[PDB]
Structure formats: C-alpha cells, structure tokens
Design a binder for this molecule. Structure first.
Ligand code: 1XK
Ligand code: 1XK
Ligand code: PRO
Ligand code: PRO
Ligand code: CA
Ligand code: CA
Ligand code: CA
Ligand code: CA
Ligand code: CA
Ligand code: CA
Ligand code: CA
Ligand code: CA
Ligand code: CA
Ligand code: CA
Ligand code: CL
Ligand code: CL
Ligand code: CL
Ligand code: ZN
Ligand code: ZN
Lengths: 499, 488
C-alpha cells in the first residue's frame, strides 16, 4: 500500500521513499542529477510567483544571461574563483571538434554578468542596476549528493544589484533576506533564524553574507535556506564597474554590489520538516492541489443513474472551490479504488481530502479529512467554501506552530565549551559566546568532533557555525570570553551540526 | 537622436542597432552568445503567460529534467543522434579533474526524458503522459550566429507527450500547432503559414513535422517559427516505453509520442517584421509597457505649485490606466529630459506615448502618440481610459494587417522552374508543384543558387493541384503544392 519506511529509524531511506512515492523526484541515469516531476515543480512555481511579485515591487527586473563563462572573466576576482574552481564544469568540444577555448558552465553568475554591468554603467544616472534571473547552475562536487538539498545541478533565482552608495546596497541586503524569511515562514511554514555568516563561512569575494538557517529536528542538523550577500566593491574594482559623479569631479567611483540566491533546496527542507510516516505533507500555501475530491462507496450494486449523480456532485464541489480560488482536483477515474486514491493523495501530502459518498450526497453533506492530523469532519454542503478555507488556514498555522515549537526547544544558549559540547551531543543547536576568528571556528569543529558522545541515532561530525543571530537569545555579558577561553567574545553565534 | 541605420539598406546593421538601442540585447564576451536584457525577457514572459495557460487547459504539466545526458542515452535513436551529434557540447572535466565519462549538454530533451517515461508507464492507465518544460538548450553550431533567430544557447519550451493511440497523439500535434499560430498571429501580430515538412526537412527521428512559417520581407527570406512533431513509435521502441494491451493479455504495445517546441526566435521575428527606421515596434499584446506617460514643459520658470500639480495629473492618468488593466509606466524622472524620454521609449517601441504638459493639463486634455504611425491625437481627459484602449487595439490590428498584406504580396504560385527562379530572385517565396522526392529537393537547391529550400507543404495551398501535374524537376508527377524560398 503506502509508505512503510519510518522517519525516526532511517531518515535517508525515508526521505528517498517519500520523494519518489509522492512523485516529486525521479532518478536520472547520471549521479546527482534528479528529475523534478510536476508535483515538486509546482511548489517551486508557487515560490516563484510570490518572490517575483515581491522583488518587482523593489524595482528588480528579470533577465537571462548566458550559461557559459570565459576563462578570462571567471578568474578576475581571485577569492571567488579560488573558492569555486574545483567544482566548475568545463565544456571542451562540440561534436568531436575542439572549441576555440574551453568555456565554463556557471556555478554562479557574478563573472558572467559583471562585464555587462561595466558596459552599462557610465554615469551616476545609470545606477542602480537591479537584475534577477531564474535559471539552473552547476556545482560539480564529488561528495555524495542528496535530492533537493545538495545537488550538482539545481534550479535557483539569483539577484544582482549595483548601487552608487553603500547605504542603498546595505538596505537591499536586508530587504531581500526578509523576503527569504517570508518564503520559509509564510509559504513553507518553516521557522528560520536570520543572521550574519561568520568570516569562515561568508561568500568568497563578498564583504559580508547574511543568511536564514532552518532546523531539521529529525536530524538534529541545521541547514542554510537562503543567502543575501553584500559584495561591496570587490567585484566592481575587478570588473571596472565605474561611474563619475560631478560632485566628485574626475575621480572614477566603483559601484557597491549585492547578490542573493534561493534554490529548490527549499522543497527538501519542507519535506524534512513537515513529512511524517504517511508521506509528504504540503503547507496549503504551496500545495499544487489543496483539496482532492474523491467519490466514495461505489459498489456493483450502485445504480448507474445514482453513479452519474455522484460524479456530478463531486464536480459540483470542484467548480465551487475553483470559483473561491481553492486549488482542487476531483480524482474521478474508474480504474482505482477509493482506498488506493486515499493512499495516493496522502503520499503526496494534499492538505484536505474531500470524501463524497452516495449517503452523504443525498444528505447534503460531505467529509473533510485533514492530512496533518488525520482528523475528520462532517460538513454541510452549503458550508463547503467557508469551512474548507478555514481548515486550510488552520493547517498552515498548525504546521508552522509545531515547527516553531521544535525550534524553540532545540536552540539554547551555552557559555562554556563543556556545556556547549554536552548540549550539542543531545541533538540541539547552541548559541555560544564567540571570538569570530576563522582559526577558532576550525578548532571548534575539530574538538567537537573529537569529544563527541554519540547518542544512538545521531550524526558523527564536527559542529560548524550557522549564523551570528541578529537577535540573539541573550545579550553578551560585558567582557565575556569566547568558548576558546583566550579571546574576548565578539557576539553570540549559533553553532550546530549542519548540511 | 535615435536610429541612424536604415532598414532597407544594410539590414544586418539595422538589426544590430535596433536590438542594442532598444536595450533588448547585449553582447557577451564569448562570441555568439547574447544577453537577454529585461526589455526582451519581458516579451518572452508575455509569450509564456499565454502559452502556459493554454497548454494547461490541454492537460500538460510543467517539470524540470536534467541538462546533462549520457553517451549511451544520446545515441539510442540513430537518426536523431546523427543529426544532432556535431553540435552537442561536451563537459569533459570539473576543475582540473578529467571526468570519468564525458557528459553532454542537452540540444533537446528526448533522450533525457524518455528513459524516465519508460519507468513511468506501467500499464495502459499511466497514459497519457503530458509534460512541458521552460528551459535552456545548447546547439553549438560553428556557423555565424544571429541574435534571437539562430543562437548557440537559447530559451524555449519543449513539450513531450506519450499516448496509447495514434488518434490522440495526432490530435494534440495539430492543437499545439494552432497555439503556435496564435502566439505569432494574436500576440505578435505576425501572420504565418501552417504546413508539413517534406521528407528531407522533417525532424530527425520523427514520422512527420508540422510547422508555422513566417516571412521577413526586408530579407526575402522565410523562417521556421515553431514546430510540432509526431514522433510516432520511433522513440518508444528504442527506450522501451510500453504497456500491455487492455484486451489482449500479454501483448506489449509501444506508446505514440509527440514533441513540440517554441523559442525566443519569436522576439527576433517580431523585430524583423514590425521594426522601422525609428527602432523597435511592440505589438500591444506583448508590450511590457503599453503606455508611457511623459511630463513635458518643465522649466525653471514653472512654479512649484504648477510642477507638483502636473506630476499629480500624470499619476492620476497612471492610476486610471492601471485601473482598466492597461500596462502603464509614468516616467516622472527629473534627471532626464523629455526629449531623451521621447527617444528612449520610441527606440523601445512602446505602443503609445502619453504627453502631458502644463497647458494641456490646464485644458483637460493630453496628447497620445501612436508608435506605429507616428500620429498625434489630442484626447479629452475624461476619455483617457476608453480612447487609449481603442488605440491599443487599433495598433495591434494595424501591425497585423500590414504584415498580412506583405505576405499576400510575397507568396505567389508558380508551376515551372523558369518562373520559380524569376519569382524567387524577386525576393519572394513560391508555392510550386512538387514530387516530394529528396533527390529532386537537393536538385532544386543546387539550381536556385543561395539555393532555395523547402519550407512547408501548406495545409491550405493557394491553388488545387490540377489532376496529373508534374513536378518542376519534370521527371515525375507532382504530389502536392509546396512552399519554397530562401530561408534563415
Ligand atoms: C541544491 C544546492 C543548494 C546549495 N546552496 C548553496 C548556496 C545556497 C545557500 O542557501 C543558496 C544559493 C544561495 C544553497 O541553496 C548548494 C548546493 C551544492 O553545493 N551543490 C553541489 C554539491 C553536489 C553534490 F553532489 C554534493 C554536494 C555536497 C556538499 N557536502 N556534501 C557532503 C555533499 C554538493 N546545492
Ligand atoms: C534560437 C534558435 C531557434 C532554433 N529553432 C529550431 C527549431 C525551432 C523552429 O520551430 C523551434 C525548436 C522548435 C527553433 O526556434 C534553432 C536555433 C539553432 O539552430 N541554433 C544553433 C545555431 C547557432 C549558431 F551560432 C548559428 C546557427 C546557424 C544556422 N544556420 N546559420 C546560417 C547559422 C545555428 N536557434
Ligand atoms: O552563490 C551565491 O551564493 C550568490 C547568490 C546568488 C548569486 N551568487
Ligand atoms: O527540437 C525539436 O524540434 C523538438 C521539439 C522540442 C523538443 N524537440
Ligand atoms: Ca501538478
Ligand atoms: Ca573556501
Ligand atoms: Ca568550493
Ligand atoms: Ca557553508
Ligand atoms: Ca587571533
Ligand atoms: Ca551516550
Ligand atoms: Ca521591462
Ligand atoms: Ca545537424
Ligand atoms: Ca508480439
Ligand atoms: Ca506486438
Ligand atoms: Cl516506503
Ligand atoms: Cl568555439
Ligand atoms: Cl531529539
Ligand atoms: Zn574563540
Ligand atoms: Zn520533383
């Protein structure tokens, strides 16, 4: 029948079973390449529709840049290329014919886009430039891939803005990060922690990186859900993105830049956070189908005239819901049982199942079964639009509240290395006082791996920084020491085992 | 102060200046690849809106398949692979590490998708499968690229359907071809000829190819606008897309498949067809901005009272046009002159410019300027909504009528090789009685020389083939009238 893999036993096999039986993912014959079937792609589209509308309000415009980079352009920002070079895929021939020059597939589009920005900017009035594109990128790592979360090819949005002043750029970084938090929290019903990446973890070639971190309670691990960088002038100086202002005559000034990105990793996090042992669970805000209508109790005995009346009543509900902007499907096919339909649509995580039997049809009522809790309700026909809308809104709230509770009990403060170690081995993420230096972050990773006390099902790995929270749980006492002991702490920092 | 190159002189240079000064295209530092700036991308989004909605009504669903394909999957259909192999780009290393096996970038996704289709079809009840994707493909030809029309990488949509019976597949082929004709004719105001590709020109690995053909009179050359193929069973026998017959126990049947594609070549044809010596000209149906509002007559003389009232009048036209679902921009920027704006939006082909100066505000009226004809109209204020919509519709009709006249002018019939050659070097396309044989089509190309090629066998030819006509080669009897011409 349905799912038989259990989430609290083997998470990896549960994850693979859920994403395939929900018809979200299919495996491609190339490792780390995954097919996004319609049930998953529609979630990406719901994300796209929301985010596109929001950034359009900010003045951002969509466009499409080439997928290839020249070796010359790829290497102009040395920090950036040093970080990305081992995983850049190279095209070297066409047919059997060697190319003029090997060309790179974009791992990210800074080095594709910024020679164009340098052309388009001549005067102070050519700024700001605010472009976004929905496209695929390729990061050809040889580590083990995981669908949605960590893949060699993925779909994303990347935004790239260039400003005359640091004030404007700084403002945008946080506006975009707020939108990413809205994607996770309002659409996907996933709570996130906003923060700044440490020096170790920031975008190579950027000034600073801001992030949203989500928590996967089944793992005890956290994952970076989205990212908003201030690149400063590090790319404009290397690509000659210069203007002249009459206020500062003669001197050429370098543009201040941001880039920001969000991928289909979103869909994996929603799968990990909300899925259960019956399969996927979709937040109503992104569900391709919010209500599935299924005609029940049909036997051989049912009169043919009665049967037609039943299929017509199911289509009645469908049209009523379509007219109130509820996304809806009537699973009317003859070639599957009611039980098989119940199971099929539960695996796919449809928020509400609408059951219509001949008895309920004739009594002008129906049954609504919520997916998150399995609770059932008998509803009078005349109320369908009203109550279904409310159940949808309650489902969204409930999913978020549950996930918020988990976050609140798995994120705590510790003020010493020993307490940090212990709390971390209990499967939580921890805010600790931290010196910020890259070397101390390496030492933290090394020794929390070394000193790990293994709880039965837990991952065996060192702790990494996640973000410096904008709003820590507590305020740093004056003169507090980092967990390293030898440097004063600069801020509370969230640390955990992570993806 | 705008366009200097003339369309009737060096067309290629006109095209280059129009697509750059309308801020549609930028050159990338890799030869032959182009940046789609927002002005162009927004047209592609309009096309996508229409077409996405329509194919959703047909039961088609969007997905995303990998961009990479393995050697073994690529060569399973021999005809298809042979035709695409010289233009397939190959990834051979990541960083410095040579890859174990080179992997290919998709030129088209039949060989990416159809292994999965074979997994998904378990039974008659798993059909039909109807999938579409909006994505990029690479066809690395070493010939001279041309923005929009012929490019090494381009955005498209590719739809791929598998059915249990040929009757279903055949129906869908024509429904999609009709939607492509609607994109060109209702959205882009470009007339097209529907037809079938000759044996020579049909999609490699398919049984037949339906197409829409457009005509660029500045060139005398035709261009293939969009195509819908019936792949028959050629691919399902190679990739084992099978289901058991519901009535004959044990007998496996091979699914009947179609595929159909439409690319950003659309935008290029729109530019070549409607553009003039002032620049781009947008059909209102796909125009990002349908009406641009431009304040005029601001001087240092004008009082702050008067300037702020003028700006507010502009914003009230903005609100009222947004209210009636006219896509409007108010260009209220102070650091650009009104002349600069007139030029900027003319080059970008905005259908209507709405000028408001102080005296016009004080006369409760404004000036509307149609981009296509250059005609200025004075419009009372209270009529803004209804008049502007009228003009927008008239613009769309006018662009389509002119272009339609052009095609009627440049597509004529001929029944000999002599007049075929005369009318062809006339800069026109000719329907001629044709035998359909490949050797004779090679021959027509060799004789006509740039040689003419076949374009389509029109669904609705201009004349009925009169009983027993012979083909222009002379050796054989004709089988159908066939559209021929020089081609992009
Ligand atoms: C889907 C996706 C999203 C993001 N990121 C990063 C940026 C961010 C942050 O939010 C968003 C754009 C801004 C995001 O989503 C990063 C990757 C990725 O690095 N892919 C390559 C790869 C392939 C592979 F086979 C294995 C591994 C791998 C890595 N460790 N292990 C143990 C295996 C990595 N992939
Ligand atoms: C944008 C686009 C659209 C279509 N197609 C074809 C199919 C169709 C029509 O319906 C749609 C998919 C269904 C369409 O739009 C085909 C190409 C293309 O073959 N590109 C490769 C290339 C690169 C290059 F640098 C030069 C040349 C080249 C070829 N001759 N010359 C004189 C130069 C070719 N490109
Ligand atoms: O890869 C990154 O993280 C940045 C954000 C999107 C574009 N590049
Ligand atoms: O390239 C072509 O012509 C067909 C139709 C789109 C997918 N393959
Ligand atoms: Ca769907
Ligand atoms: Ca690094
Ligand atoms: Ca790296
Ligand atoms: Ca990291
Ligand atoms: Ca130090
Ligand atoms: Ca223990
Ligand atoms: Ca635009
Ligand atoms: Ca070829
Ligand atoms: Ca047999
Ligand atoms: Ca047989
Ligand atoms: Cl299972
Ligand atoms: Cl080359
Ligand atoms: Cl736990
Ligand atoms: Zn420290
Ligand atoms: Zn002949």
């Amino acid at each position: 029948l349905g799912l038989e893999a259990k989430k609290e036993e083997n998470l990896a096999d549960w994850y693979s079973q859920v994403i395939t039986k929900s018809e979200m993912i299919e495996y491609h014959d190339i490792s780390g390449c995954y097919i996004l079937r319609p049930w998953a792609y529609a979630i990406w589209e719901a994300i796209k529709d929301f985010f596109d509308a929001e950034i359009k309000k900010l003045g951002v415009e969509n466009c499409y840049f080439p997928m290839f980079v020249s070796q010359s352009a790829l290497e102009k920002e040395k920090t950036h290329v040093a970080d990305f070079a081992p995983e850049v895929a190279w095209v070297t021939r066409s047919g059997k014919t060697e190319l003029a020059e090997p060309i790179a597939i974009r791992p990210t589009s800074e080095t594709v886009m910024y020679p164009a920005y340098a052309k388009w900017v001549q005067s102070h009035r050519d700024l700001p430039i605010k472009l976004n594109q929905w496209c695929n990128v390729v990061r050809w790592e040889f580590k083990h891939p995981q669908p949605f979360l960590r893949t060699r090819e993925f779909l994303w949005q990347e935004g790239h803005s260039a400003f005359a002043t640091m004030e404007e750029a700084a403002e945008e970084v946080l506006q975009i990060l707020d939108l990413y938090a809205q994607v996770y929290e309002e659409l996907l019903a996933i709570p996130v922690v906003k923060g700044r990446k440490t020096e170790k973890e920031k975008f190579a070639g950027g000034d600073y990186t801001t992030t949203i971190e989500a928590f996967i309670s089944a793992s005890g691990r956290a994952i970076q859900g989205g990212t908003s960088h201030h690149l400063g002038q590090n790319f404009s100086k290397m690509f000659e993105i210069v203007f002249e202002d009459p206020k500062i005559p003669g001197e050429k000034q370098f543009a201040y830049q941001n880039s920001w990105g969000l991928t289909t990793r979103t869909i994996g996090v929603m799968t990990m956070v909300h899925g259960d042992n019956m399969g996927l669970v979709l937040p109503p805000r992104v569900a391709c189908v919010q209500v599935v209508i299924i005609p029940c109790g049909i036997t051989n005995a049912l009169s043919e005239e009665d049967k037609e009346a039943l299929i017509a009543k199911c289509n009645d509900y469908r049209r009523r819901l379509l007219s109130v902007n509820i996304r809806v499907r009537a699973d009317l096919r003859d070639n599957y049982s009611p039980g098989w339909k119940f199971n099929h649509w539960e695996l796919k995580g449809v928020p509400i199942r609408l059951e219509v039997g001949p008895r309920d049809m004739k009594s002008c009522q129906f049954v609504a079964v919520r997916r998150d809790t399995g609770e059932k309700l008998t509803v009078a026909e005349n109320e369908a639009e009203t109550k279904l809308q409310a159940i949808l809104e309650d489902i969204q709230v409930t999913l978020f509240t549950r996930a918020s509770e988990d976050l609140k009990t798995h994120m705590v403060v510790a003020n010493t290395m020993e307490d940090f170690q212990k709390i971390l081995d209990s499967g939580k993420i921890v805010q600790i006082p931290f010196c910020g230096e890259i070397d101390c972050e390496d030492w933290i990773k090394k020794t929390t791996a070394r000193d790990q006390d293994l709880e039965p099902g837990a991952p065996s790995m060192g702790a990494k920084s996640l973000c410096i929270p904008f709003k820590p749980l507590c305020e740093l006492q004056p003169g507090a020491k980092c967990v390293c002991g030898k440097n004063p702490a600069k801020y509370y920092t969230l640390f955990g085992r992570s993806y």
